[PDB]
């Protein structure tokens, strides 16, 4: 588990734009599936997450 303060299994600091963009695209693709979930539903689900 990601123990907070653990020098090894800590939280990933030093993130850049490319990782965020890749997330954005795949999440918009994986969560939409094949039309299973609406775009707005996905949007506020991520807002809450």
């Amino acid at each position: 588990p990601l123990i907070k303060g653990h020098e090894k299994y800590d939280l990933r600091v030093r993130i850049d734009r490319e990782e965020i963009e890749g997330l954005g695209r795949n999440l918009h693709n994986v969560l939409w599936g094949g039309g299973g979930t609406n775009d707005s539903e996905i949007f506020y689900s991520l807002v809450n997450i």
Binding site: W32, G35, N38, D39
Partner: protein, 48 residues
């Protein structure tokens, strides 16, 4: 058959197909149904 047309009136005016949720156009659906001879199959199944 009067509330159906009501609902497709609702569907046409306000659904906003966009891109994620589009529909197969009705000509394509009817071509698929007739190309399978669905009417002939139904008649033969009912008649036998």
């Amino acid at each position: 058959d009067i509330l159906g047309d009501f609902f497709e009136s609702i569907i046409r005016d306000g659904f906003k197909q966009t891109k994620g949720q589009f529909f197969t156009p009705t000509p394509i659906v009817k071509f698929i149904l007739y190309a399978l001879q669905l009417d002939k199959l139904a008649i033969d199944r009912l008649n036998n």
